[PDB]
Structure formats: C-alpha cells, structure tokens
Amino acid sequence: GKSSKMLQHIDYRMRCILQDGRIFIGTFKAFDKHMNLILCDCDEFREKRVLGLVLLRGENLVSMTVEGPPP
Amino acid sequence: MEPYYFVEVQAPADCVSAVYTVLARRRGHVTQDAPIPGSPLYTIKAFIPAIDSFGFETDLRTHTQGQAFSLSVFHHWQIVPGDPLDKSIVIRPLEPQ
Amino acid sequence: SIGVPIKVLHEAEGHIVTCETNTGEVYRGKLIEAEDNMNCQMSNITVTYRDGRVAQLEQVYIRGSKIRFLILPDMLKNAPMLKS
Amino acid sequence: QKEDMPPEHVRKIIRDHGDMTNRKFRHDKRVYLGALKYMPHAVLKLLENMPMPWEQIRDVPVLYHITGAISFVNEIPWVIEPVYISQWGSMWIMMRREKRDRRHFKRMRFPPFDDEEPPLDYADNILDVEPLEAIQLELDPEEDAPVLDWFYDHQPLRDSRKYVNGSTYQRWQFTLPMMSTLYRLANQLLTDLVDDNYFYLFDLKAFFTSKALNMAIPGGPKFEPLVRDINLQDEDWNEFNDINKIIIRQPIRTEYKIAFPYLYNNLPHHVHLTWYHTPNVVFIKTEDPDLPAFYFDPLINPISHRHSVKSQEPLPDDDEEFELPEFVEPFLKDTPLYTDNTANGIALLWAPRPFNLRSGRTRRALDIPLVKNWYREHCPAGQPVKVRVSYQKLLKYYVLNALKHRPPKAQKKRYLFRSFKATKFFQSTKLDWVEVGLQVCRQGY
Amino acid sequence: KAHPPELKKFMDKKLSLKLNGGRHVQGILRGFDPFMNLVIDECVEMATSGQQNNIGMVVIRGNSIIMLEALERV
Amino acid sequence: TKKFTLMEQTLPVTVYEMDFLADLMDNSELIRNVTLCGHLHHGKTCFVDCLIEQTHPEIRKRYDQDLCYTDILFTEQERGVGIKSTPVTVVLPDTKGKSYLFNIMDTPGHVNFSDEVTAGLRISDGVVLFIDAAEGVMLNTERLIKHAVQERLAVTVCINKIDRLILELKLPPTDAYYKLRHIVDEVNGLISMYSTDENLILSPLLGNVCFSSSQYSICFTLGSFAKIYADTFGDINYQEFAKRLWGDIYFNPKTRKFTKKAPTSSSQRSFVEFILEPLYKILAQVVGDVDTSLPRTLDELGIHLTKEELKLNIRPLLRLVCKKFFGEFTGFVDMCVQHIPSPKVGAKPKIEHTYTGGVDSDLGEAMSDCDPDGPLMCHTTKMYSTDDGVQFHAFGRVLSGTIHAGQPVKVLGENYTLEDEEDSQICTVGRLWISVARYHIEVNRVPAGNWVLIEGVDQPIVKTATITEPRGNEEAQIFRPLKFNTTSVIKIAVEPVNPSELPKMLDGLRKVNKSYPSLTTKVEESGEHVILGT
RNA sequence: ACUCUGGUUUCUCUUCAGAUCGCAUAAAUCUUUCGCCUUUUACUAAAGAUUUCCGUGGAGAGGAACAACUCUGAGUCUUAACCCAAUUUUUUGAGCCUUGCCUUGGCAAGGCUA
RNA sequence: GGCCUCCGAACG
C-alpha cells in the first residue's frame, strides 16, 4: 500500500546477504521490481576487497539490513 | 578577369519582374527564373557582374517594398568586354563607359 | 517500463566494466551492448577463473539470468539518477 | 470605507449653495480659493471622463468636497480588448457608411455660448429624459452577439468565466469567437498585413539609423546635423581617402550606405543599425468560408516519384507481422479540417500584436488606442503633398518619442490623489459627464 | 516487451558455447529464438578429458547457457 | 564598460555534473561533435535554444523573447546570424537510454560567414544541415553541400519549421508527404549527385533526416515517432516499426497489413495517416479547437496543464504542449550517434585528409592518440575574443595529448614546415575553457579528443595554427588550414584620419584579422591597408 | 477506493521595480550648441545630466462581500469472473563426501552425484 | 522616382 518500505532505505548504508554467503555493503541509491541493487563504494565480505559501484541481481539476494547513516 | 556574383532571389511574380528591371538597370545578365513550388514563391538565380553587384540587395529589397529576399556569391569569372591599354578609352572621370 | 538500475546499465554502455557469472568467472572489459534482461556483449576480456588462471578473449556475450552482479565505473554515481 | 453619497444631495445642495456666495459661502470663500487653487483636479477629471462616441452612457463615481468647493473624478482608462478597438474602429466604419449616406450634411460647430449666460440647471432634465444617441451598430451574423452585449459598457464583462472580474480593469480573458469576431470587426477597420521586411527598413531602428547617420530617406522625418558642427576636412586627407580617377558604377545610393555602416565611414558614432533582411515567410490569405482545409496553392510537384527511388525492406511478411494494432492506430477520432472554425483560427494563428495576444492584461484607453500611426508608416503616393509631409510629421513625432526612449527610474508612491480622502475631504458618488462636467464648469465660473 | 536478444552480428559465425556443469560445445550459429534456443551447425562437444566429438546440427536451450562466445571477429 | 557580449559567468545546468560529464566526454568514445547549417537564416540558433532549453533549468520563455541567452552579439545576432559561428557543447540523452556528449556549433547564413562556418566545420568530423520546410534548400544548402562533400564529412538532414511551414500554408497531408519527399529527393539527389560513394543514403527510414519545427520547438524523427507510438501501445515494435513506418505502404484491415503496392483504399501513404495524421491533428487541436477540444485531446494524449497555464495563450500552449508530447529529445541524439562516426573511425580519414604527413609516426601518432591518449599534439580550430577586448581566447580542436595549465607547447605557423619551422614557439596554457551554452568551464588539463578553448596563446597564434609538444615531436605538426571555398572580391582600404593612429590601425588590423580569418588584410605597395572579403 | 489537510473579487498600509522593454508614453530645469531676434516670459531643434505627471509591476500585512464552495500535498491506499509462466523474482532441481584451517563449534577448497 | 524650415500672445 505505502510501498515506502524500499523507499525508506534509500541512501542508507545497507549490509547485503547473498545466497552463497557473501556480504555486500554499499550506499543504496536505487532498486526496482527485480531487486536490482545499486551500491556506491561497495565492499565485499566473506576478507575484504574494494568493489566500488556494483549492480547486484535480485536472484542471488537473500536479506538486507541497515548498516548506518548515509556518508 | 573578375568573378560573376550569382544571387538567388525569393519574391512574387511582380517583384520578380521588378528584380529583372533592377538587374537591367545594373546591366546584370542573370542566371534563371523559376516559379519555386511548395508555396507560390518565385525564385530566380541571377548571374551578375561583381562590379555592378554593389547595392543589389538593398535596392532589391527597397524596390520590392520589403520583399525579394536574395543572396549573392562569387561564381566563375568574367572575361571583360575588351582588352586594356586603349588610347581612346579615357573620356571623362564621372561619365561611365 | 524499465527499472532505474537497468537504465544505468544502458548508460554504462561503452566503458570498461567487470562481470561475474553465477559460476564465478570474472569478466572485465568494455561493454558493447546491454539489454533490459541484462544481456551483456563485451570486448577485450581478461578472464579470472576460480583457480586464479587468466587469459584473453576478444568477444563474449552473456545471458542475463546467469550474471551474479556487475561492476560499473564510478563516473555514473553523480547523476542523472540521483534522487531523494 | 468610503461610501457613495446621494448625488442630488451633495451635487445639487453644494453647487446650489456654493455659487450663491453672500453670507452662506462667506466661510466657504477660502475653500473655493483651494478649489481654484488646484488646477489638475478638473483637468485630469474631465480628461479622465470620456464616454466616447462608441457608446452612450453616463460617468463614474467622483469625490465632491464636503465644503462644496470642487470635485475630482478618478477613473482608470480600462482598455478592454481588440474587440473594443474593433468597437471604436467599428464606429469608424459605420461612421464611414453614414458619411457616404446623408447627402445633406449636418451643421454641428455652434459653441452654444452667445456671450455667457447658459448657467444651465437643465441637468435635471438630462436626468428626466435620455438622448439614446450614438451606438447604431446592428451588424452581426449571429456571431458578435456576445461582443454586441459587450459593445457598450463601462465594464465590458461584469462577472463571467473568461473576464477581468475586477471593479474596473484586470487581466483580460476571452474565447475563440471573441477573437473571430474581433478579427472580423477589426478587419473591417484598418488592418495590417504580415510584417516580414515590409515593416522593416522604414521606422524604429531604421529611423534611428537615419537620424544617426543624418541623411534623408525616400521621404520621412528629419532631425539635425547631430554631432557634426559645420565642416571638417583636409586637403591631404581628401586626396588620400578619395581619388580624382576612381571607379564609377552607381551614383552612391544612400539606401546602400544606410543599412551598411561600413559603406559610410563619416561620423559612425552612436548608431543603432544593421538589421539584416527579414525571415521572408509566407502567410496564406483567407478566402470564402468553404472547404477543404487546403486552399490549394500552386504546387505542381515534380511528377511525384517518376522512377526516382524507394524505401527498403518491401517484404509483406515482416510488414503485416511488424505491428500488432491492439489499440487505435491514429491518435484520436476527429475531423481536423473544418472543425470549430479551424480556418478562422488557422488564420488567427498569424495575427497582429493586439489580436495575437489572445487573453490580454491591461492597456490605457486614454493614452494609446490608436493603430493609425503604423498604418500611415511608409505611405504610398495616393495622398497629396501636404498630406505626405503631414505623414512625415506624424512619423517625426513617433520617431522622436521612439528615439527618446525612457529612463524608467523609481517613483515615490501612487494613489495620493485618492489618498487625500483618508481624513475628511470629499465624498464620492456615481455621477454623469453632464452632471460632473457641469459641476466642474460651475467650479470654473 | 518480449525483446529477442540480438545475435545478428554472430550469425554464421563459429561460436564457443560454455554450458553449466563443466560442459563446453563449439559450432556455427544458424539462428535463435526469443527463448535463447540456439541452432548450432557442426557442433563439437568438448569433453572434460579433452577428446572432441562432432554431434552435428543441434538445438541448445538458453536455460543451460552460462555464456556464449565467438571465435571470429564480428 | 559595456562589453559587447558575455560568453561566460552563468550558473550550471540541470542533471549535469562537471565530474561525470567532463570525464565522460574526455574518457569514453560516446562523445562527438557537429555543426548544423543547411539553409541560411533557417533558425539554426533556435535548435541550440531548444537543446539548451531542455538542458539548463533556467531558459528564456519563447513568449517573452527568444529562448537564446540574452546579450549575445546584441544587434549582430538580433538582426541575423552575425557570429561567424561559435562552439558549444552539452550532454544530451538519447532515445536508447544512454546519454552522450554532443558539441554543436551554430552557423551563420551569410556567404563569407558561411565560409568561416566551414573553416570552423573543418574541426568536427561531422555536420548536420538545417533546411526549412517552406523555402526548402537554399543557396547555403547547395554551397554547404558541395563544401561538405569535398570535405568528406558526414551530414545529417534536419528539417526545421515543419509544422510552421505546413501550418501557415495549410498544406494537405498528400502535398506534405510529397513535398517533403521532394525536398528529401533533392537532398539525396545532390548528395549522390556530388561525388564519391552513394552510401550516404539520405532518407527518413535511414535516420539521416529529422523532422522538427522551430515554432513549437518539436524535434522528431522516425525512431522518435516509433518510440513514442510504441511507448503508448505496442512497444514490441521498434526496429520493424520505423522500417515500415513510412516507405510506400497502406494500413490494411487485417489488423496490421502493410500494402507495399496498390492503393488498397486505405490511404495515399502510411506516413501521412500514421505519421502526419497524429501530427497535423495535434497542431489542429490548438487555435479553434484549443479551448473546445482541450479535455478530450489532452486526456487522450495524457497531457495536462494548470488552469492558468492552459489559458495562457495559443502559442505558449502550443510550445508547452509540444514540450509535453514531443519535447523529449530522441531523434537528435539517436539519429546523431547512428550518423556521426566514432572519434577514431571518423578521425582516421579526417587525420589522413587533414595533416600533411601521414602513415607512420604521424597518422600512427594520431591513431594511437585517438582512444587512450595523445603524445601532446594540439591541432586547433580558431580563436575568438574573450569577455574583454584586450586579449582573445583560442577556441580550437585538440588532436592529441592532455593540455595542462601552464604546460609549454610548440606552435608553428602557416608557411612553417615540419622540416624547418620558423614560427614554431613554445607557449603556456593559462586556463582551459569549455563552451557550454552561455557559460564556460575552466579546467587545468583536458585530455585528447575534445575541442576546447584555452588562454595564453595570442600573438603567436595567427589564423589556424596547430600546437605540438615542446619535446620536438616530428612527423607533420602544424596541420593544414581549412579552405573557405570562396574568392576575395570586395576590397575596402581604410586609412586613419589622424597620422598618430597608424599603430592603432596596424594593431587593430592584426587583432581584427585574427578575429575574422575569413577576411584578408593586405598592405598596398602605396602604403595603404586594403581589406578583402567575400 | 477511505481519512487529515480547507478558497475567490474588491479597498487600504508597508517594502522592492538604473528590469526583457513597465508595447502604440507627456512635461519641466540646468550646461551648451544652434534658430530667428528690440529686452522677458514664452519660443525654432540637437546632445548630455537632473527631475515631475498619467500610469504600471513584484512581495508582505490589515478589511468586507454567498463563503462554505471547492482545490490541495500526503497518510497501510484490506475485492470475488477466466486462462498462463523455460532469463529476473509465489508452480522451478538441491544435497552428500573428503581434505586443510579454527579451541571446538564453525570457515575455505576439491571431489561425488542420478 | 518622391523629400515642402515657415507658422503668435502679451507686456514694455
């Protein structure tokens, strides 16, 4: 009804959990019906590597939680 | 040798005849005249001497009462009516020849 | 009719990008074409397998459903798609 | 809030006891010295009250001094629209029809003074009966009927949907038929064609260029030597610049040097000029109200194709299978040819500034409801000598006011004329040009 | 929508087709559908041991294709 | 004070980042440039006013005055053209969804001014033509078509004032499609009638022409009409739609059955019905049908406006309606990138026909310069006056290298050659300037493949002079100048009235000649200074 | 498809308008040039800077008149006939074994499946 | 091929 559930979490730092166990954290600027994630200055946890802008497909995503306030 | 300025003109039939009278006053020997379609707009390109082409657009738009929009450019060259160095050529400074 | 991340994927055509399929192969190179289903046609690819070996491949085209995610250059983060 | 007093009480009582003097106005003496002491009240009031020949009506509210000294009439010009300009110009067309008729003209003139003894109180009879004169425009083919109801009014639209909806004047609004009949009755009067280059190379920037270069035109205004004093030259400079033996083709056309500041190098200081040509467009003229929407101008297409070339992919399978008309292929169902005066509105697409403005805002009917100047610009030879030089004089005044421009600096405040009613000064009321004008005449005597 | 993927640049080109589960085939592309089913001419299956066998013209389902690769310049 | 015109000191634009757009134009190959002229005074600037109007948030309302920026050339541009052509650049999105960097330079219509417009056109690798639907092709379109054909530059046919010419003349759809088809037949007839290959293929289905109207500022094309109509309904048809959009076909009752031949009673042509029918009716929905049909047509088209906005006036509601319907730019960028070649693909023949020495170390130095970086070789365009008349900025093409602020460069002259260069001298670049609409962006270092303006080179820069690295890079520096395709005719000898004004006339003649390279200032043997122009 | 939000004309006061022209815009003063002139007011016609009239525009505040007319941005804005999913999510296939690391728990890797 | 400054009232 309100649909703001995903609209509330825009710009926030989000900790993502994938189907294989990977962890993505980046500034969340956009979404869609297909659960396409837009993560700015994203990082990958398993070991940490520098990713940057990353577009994640919604098929491999499981859950998400708020990491913190926008930078 | 001097170039021959050609001027395409847009105007109705009356202003086209008046443009031909202006070119006749300037002794210009034109290019071609056609009833330009898409709208009854007469377009006439003109072959003219570059020496007599001065003030052709001003007097053209003036004699047309705010009509006959034309544009000129250098085209080819003119071989002149005769050869220079004539002893009888000098007549009067103000009188044209 | 087209999602915002998909429109960003269209905007990123012509830049060096990194792609990893569902099987783990890393593909990095210029993105020639991108569709609405995230089909990616790329050129001058340096492959990174799961064992660490590398190679060079001229032309590749990937199914949209088999892509785990994509990596795009940072030049697209400023705009037009920034909205509050 | 200021309320309108009874007109006969303040008017008749004041003006009745005001001119008697004796011991009744003895205290009112100085008040009358203030009345006569203020010139602009009667001048701006009388000049501000103009019922005009285009209609027949009375005047507006005015403030009459509580001491009976004098009054003042504040009325905004409240110019309505080009339909109103077509009401005045329509009175000029009907006035021309009456000019062609009436083989025996009238007298008029007759300033009914005969020395002076018309201290006329007959304004009471002017309230008794009415002339019901002027007007006399019945012309309309079931079209201008709304403008006919708006033909004679002090406030053309009292309250409506499209209207000013103010007390006197406000942002104007109208419909399509108001523009139709506006261009009809306005077309009956003097009307201007498309501008193009016909309106240029004559006045405005052209006149300022002629006044800048200080050179005559094929008729027109004249200004002055401007910066040039008398003569400045030199024997060596003239021999270097000019030549005793040079090229001679045309006798130095002034129109060629006018539009070309590089052709005339004498005194190129403070000159606004060089407007190059025009758009050179074509506006299709109107015709009888018949069909089709295309006037069928001369075209003669070059034999259509005539074995020139064609498009690609002429495959019927990909053609019939290339589209799925699940919806309507055209935009919407209509007849965009003759529908709703599409020819009259199409001709209204190109319209003069008053007509093309559609819904207006405000204008001064006491200042510039006159298009005759532009109509007189660049007049043909159909007028005599004195009329031609007179037209050059009108263009000289218009060129003077045009070249004068304006320093639109700041001002102090407005309404000060009406702001004098804050304390006890005067009291307004609805009055007529004969009653208020006659009261101003008694204030003059 | 229903936009078919554009292989028109890969038409009649020798392809290297990577399949899931360590399967690899190569051949020439004779056409495609909106479902990414491929008609592959002279398809040769790449065995995990390195041996090659020619299975002929075959249809390959778009579901099982991780990536399609061209061995020529298009 | 009272400087002539202000080309700088303006705010930014909307949805435009200097980082993303600047590094995107200086990084990827999606950036391009062109110049649209066609017919003289055919409303060329109006197109830049439409694109810049859709780019920057603050745009001049067409009802008040022209949409172009105020105080530009004053009466020079107010009277017509004036500016011998000025460069501009903006980031325009495309109908495909991907944006692009397009540098468009308007061109004047005057003869000599068109020659200078060609001299400036020698920089960009492509050109578009502005052809009014009323007058068709003018003399500037024929001369510009001959000069563009001799320059081997891709041209894009662009129709202007289509709805203005068809609306003012009340042209029927048959005479509109036949008349426009005759104009395209003359464009393709002159293009194929010029020389070399016929591969230009000027045609509406090929995307070479874009139908636009400057009155309502409506820019459309084949892919734009197919994208709008498909976007409304039947979005599955895009390529097969625009291909079958016009052609010669009729719409047959079978749902879609397109008849290639025969009348089939449907219509004279498919473009008239399916194209001109929603077009002319949209223009017919105004005027007489404006107030009447506003709810019906506006509700059917989905457009809406405020009570005061819809009641404004005829023309403002027409330009606003076209902005609410066709206002989105599609065929300009979509038909642009599809026409205009890439930087390298269009650069290799351009560098082959531009620089003198080709092949190795020269064209190869330019070939390697294209995509990644150049070895600091700057082949300019021209030089224009700055905001102050004291100095003049150099607005030019950069062939190679990343220009750095204060970095020296070896600039040769005209008569100077790669073997022996007498006019070659090092110079420092004060600041980089990119011309966007009414403003400019100053940058310290601009990579290769972009035409930008710089400062610090004034006296050594004369007409068209290419700059090279101070390291002494060999192999054909100082690229060849552009040909004006005209002959000097008018000779005006100007002499100072006062004898002490000789240095002011000489320096003013040098700076004036550098400001207008088309004119030729030559000192006569008698001592007088004579000028030559077309 | 529910609820909170809740409007138009006119009259005054206080600010801003060296403005894209406050569309067809008047008059005065002074420094001079000039016109005719027997001194002055008036006055012939050009420049410049100093201004007033008729106006006019923007913002805020205070009033009455049908105001109870309607707009408004949002707020979780709870619905059944019929045929359908082989590239994005409700008709869609995962697990086991072994080795190494970790205090174990657990993690990484390879293999096995049918 | 055209251009047409003119324009009076008191006092003294």
Q: Do residue F289 and residue D339 have CB atoms under 8 angstroms apart?
A: yes
Report how far residue D203's alpha carbon sits from residue D199's, in angstroms, rounded to the nearest whole number.
8
Report how far residue F111's alpha carbon sits from residue F138's, in angstroms, rounded to the nearest whole number.
12
Nucleotides of H under 7 A from a protein CB: 1-6
Query: Nearest to residue D330, comparing CAs of F262, F184, F158, F173?
Result: F173
Report how far residue D328's alpha carbon sits from residue D307's, in angstroms, rounded to the nearest whole number.
34
Report how far residue F110's alpha carbon sits from residue F144's, in angstroms, rounded to the nearest whole number.
12
Q: What residues contact residue D236 under an 8 Å CB cut-off, 6+ apart? A: none
Q: For this experimental structure, what is the resolution in angstroms?
A: 5.9
Q: What is the 3-state secondary structure (H, E, C) of chain D?
A: CCCCCCHHHHHHHHHHHHCCCCCCCCCCHHHHHHHHHCCHHHHHHHHHCCCCCCCCCCCCEEEEECCCCCEECCCCCCCCCHHHHHHHHHHHHHHHHHHHCCCCCCCCCCCCCCCCCCCCCCHHHHHHCCCCCCCCCCCCCCCCHHHHHCCCCCCCCCCCCCCCCCCCCCCCCCCHHHHHHHHHHHHHCCCCCCCCCCCCCCCCHHHHHHHHHCCCCCCCCCCCCCCCCCCCCCHHHHHHHCCCCCCCCCCCCHHHHHCCCCCCCCCCCCCCCCCCCCCCCCCCCCCCCCCCCCCCCCCCCCCCCCCCCCCCCCCHHHHHCCCCCCCCCCCCCCCCCCCCCHHHHHHHHCCCHHHHCCCCCCCCCCCCCCCHHHHHCCCCCCCCHHHHHHHHHHHHHHHHHHHHCCCCCCCCCCCHHHHCCCCCCEEEEECCHHHHHHHHHHHHC
- List the single residue in F17, F28, F99 with the smallest CB-CB distance to C15: F28
Q: What angle do CA F185, F191, F196 make, to 5 degrees?
A: 140
Which residues of F fall in the annotated binding site for GTP? 38-45, 106-110, 160-163
E-strand ranges in A1-70 read 13-18, 23-28, 37-45, 48-56, 61-68
User: How near does any CA of chain A get to the CA of C57, in Å?
Assistant: 23
Q: What residues contact residue D120 under an 8 Å CB cut-off, 6+ apart? A: D438
CA–C1' distance A56–G101 (Å)?
31
Residue of C nearest to F22 (CA): C75
Contact between F389 and F6 under an 8 Å Cβ cutoff? The reply is no
Note which residues in 192-231 of chain D have CB less than 8 A from chain F: 205
Contact between F284 and D336 under an 8 Å Cβ cutoff? The reply is yes
Q: If you compute the radius of gyration of chain C from its CA atoms, what whole number of angstroms results?
A: 13
Q: What is the largest CA-CA distance in chain C?
A: 43
Q: What residues contact residue F25 under an 8 Å CB cut-off, 6+ apart? A: F31, F89, F91, F101, F450
User: How near does any CA of chain D get to the CA of B21, in Å?
Assistant: 15
Tokens, residue D378: 């660049």
Question: Number of E:F CB contacts under 8 A?
Answer: 4
Tokens, residue C37: 């289903």
What angle do helix axes F331-339 and F222-232 make, rounded to 10 degrees?
130
Report how far residue F469's alpha carbon sits from residue F157's, in angstroms, rounded to the nearest whole number.
39
Chain F residues with CB-CB distance to E5 below 8 A? none
Contact between A37 and A58 under an 8 Å Cβ cutoff? The reply is yes
Whether D220 CB is under 7 Å from strand G: no
Q: Which residues does a gap of C–N over 2.5 Å follow in chain D? A: none
Cis omega (within 30 of 0) on the bond before D292? yes
Query: Nearest to residue F12, comparing CAs of F4, F2, F22, F3?
Result: F22
Report how far residue D80's alpha carbon sits from residue D361's, in angstroms, rounded to the nearest whole number.
9
Amino acid of residue F175: D
Half-sphere exposure (CA, 13 Å, Cβ side) for D402? 19
Q: Where are the domains of chain C?
A: 2-84
Report how far residue B33's alpha carbon sits from residue B41's, in angstroms, rounded to the nearest whole number.
11
Domains and CATH numbers, chain E: 8-70 (2.30.30.100)
* Burial class for B81, CB neighbours closer than 10 Å (0-12, 13-18, 19+): exposed
Residue of D nearest to B64 (CA): D198
Query: Nearest to residue D81, comparing CAs of D411, D418, D360, D440?
Result: D360
Contact between F187 and F137 under an 8 Å Cβ cutoff? The reply is yes
Cross-strand partners of F385: F392
* F40 and B CB contact within 8 Å: yes
Query: Nearest to residue F432, comparing CAs of F34, F18, F71, F2?
Result: F18
Hits for CB < 7 Å against strand G across D residues 96-125: none
CA–C1' distance D351–G57 (Å)?
26
Hits for CB < 7 Å against strand G across A residues 26-65: 32-36, 46, 57-59
Cross-strand partners of A37: A56
Q: What residues contact residue C18 under an 8 Å CB cut-off, 6+ apart? A: C26, C27, C28, C70, C71
For residue F496, the tally of other CB atoms under 10 A from its CB is 15
- DSSP label at F460? S
Q: What is the 3-state secondary structure (H, E, C) of B3-72?
A: EEEEEEEEECHHHHHHHHHHHHHCCCCCCEEEEECCCCEEEEECEEECCCCCCHHHHHHHHCCCCCEEEE
Report how far residue F283's alpha carbon sits from residue F23's, in angstroms, rounded to the nearest whole number.
41
- Experimental technique, in short, is cryo-EM
Cis omega (within 30 of 0) on the bond before C80? yes
Contact between E67 and E25 under an 8 Å Cβ cutoff? The reply is no
- DSSP label at F500? G
For residue F442, the tally of other CB atoms under 10 A from its CB is 15
Chain D residues with CB-CB distance to B66 below 8 A? 196-202, 278
Q: What residues contact residue D34 under an 8 Å CB cut-off, 6+ apart? A: D69
For residue F224, the tally of other CB atoms under 10 A from its CB is 25
Residues with CB under 7 A from strand H: B 59, 62-63; D 216-220, 222, 380-381, 385-386, 388-389, 392-393
The helix or strand, by DSSP H or E, that contains position C57, with its residue range, turns out to be: strand C54-62
Interfacial residues of C (vs A; Cβ cutoff 8 Å): 3-6, 8-9, 22, 38, 65, 67-74, 76-77, 81-82, 84
Cα distances (Å, whole numbers) of residue E45 to C58, E19, E41, F148: 21, 10, 12, 54
Helix (H, G, I), strand (E, B) or coil at E6: coil
Which residues of F fall in the annotated binding site? 38-45, 106-110, 160-163
Report how far residue D227's alpha carbon sits from residue C59's, in angstroms, rounded to the nearest whole number.
77
Report how far residue A13's alpha carbon sits from residue A21's, in angstroms, rounded to the nearest whole number.
19
Report how far residue F137's alpha carbon sits from residue D106's, in angstroms, rounded to the nearest whole number.
62
CA–C1' distance D31–G61 (Å)?
36
Q: What residues contact residue F236 under an 8 Å CB cut-off, 6+ apart? A: D324, E1, E2, E3, F230
Amino acid of residue F40: L
Backbone angles phi, psi at F34, to 5 degrees: -165, 175
Q: Among 2.30.30.100, 3.40.50.720, 3.40.190.10, 3.40.50.1360, name the CATH number for the domain at C2-84.
A: 2.30.30.100
Contact between F381 and F87 under an 8 Å Cβ cutoff? The reply is yes
* A31 and C CB contact within 8 Å: yes
Query: Nearest to residue D66, comparing CAs of D16, D108, D10?
Result: D10
Hits for CB < 7 Å against strand G across D residues 148-177: 164-168, 170
Cα distances (Å, whole numbers) of residue D420 to D40, D46, F100, F516: 14, 19, 66, 64
Contacting subunits of A (3+ beta carbon pairs below 8 A) = C
Interfacial residues of D (vs B; Cβ cutoff 8 Å): 196-202, 218, 244-250, 253, 255-256, 258-260, 277-278, 280, 282, 297-302, 378
Amino acid of residue D216: A
Q: Do residue C3 and residue A60 have CB atoms under 8 angstroms apart?
A: no
The helix or strand, by DSSP H or E, that contains position F128, with its residue range, turns out to be: strand F126-132
For residue F452, the tally of other CB atoms under 10 A from its CB is 27
Nucleotides of G under 7 A from a protein CB: 8-14, 17-26, 33-34, 45-48, 51-57, 63, 75-78, 86-89, 93, 107-110
Report how far residue D121's alpha carbon sits from residue F371's, in angstroms, rounded to the nearest whole number.
99
**Best mutation site among F28, F99, F231 for testing chain C: the one with the most C CBs within 10 Å?**
F28
F480-483 contacts: CB < 8 A, separation 24 or more? F480/F354, F480/F355, F480/F356, F481/F119, F481/F414, F482/F118, F482/F119, F482/F120, F482/F121, F482/F122, F483/F118, F483/F119
* F12 and C CB contact within 8 Å: no
Query: Nearest to residue D78, comparing CAs of D53, D58, D60?
Result: D60
Contact between F222 and F205 under an 8 Å Cβ cutoff? The reply is yes
* C81 and F CB contact within 8 Å: no
Q: What residues contact residue F398 under an 8 Å CB cut-off, 6+ apart? A: F378, F379, F380, F446, F448, F449, F450, F451, F452
Q: Which nucleotide is nearest to D47 (CA to C1')?
A: G54
Q: If you compute the radius of gyration of chain A from its CA atoms, what whole number of angstroms results?
A: 11
For residue D367, the tally of other CB atoms under 10 A from its CB is 9
* C1 and F CB contact within 8 Å: yes
Chain F residues with CB-CB distance to D339 below 8 A? 284, 288-289
What angle do helix axes F173-192 and F277-284 make, rounded to 10 degrees?
120
- List the single residue in F168, F205, F289 with the smallest CB-CB distance to D281: F168
* F16 and C CB contact within 8 Å: yes
- List the single residue in C1, C58, C66 with the smallest CB-CB distance to E67: C66
Residue with tokens 């209204």: D348
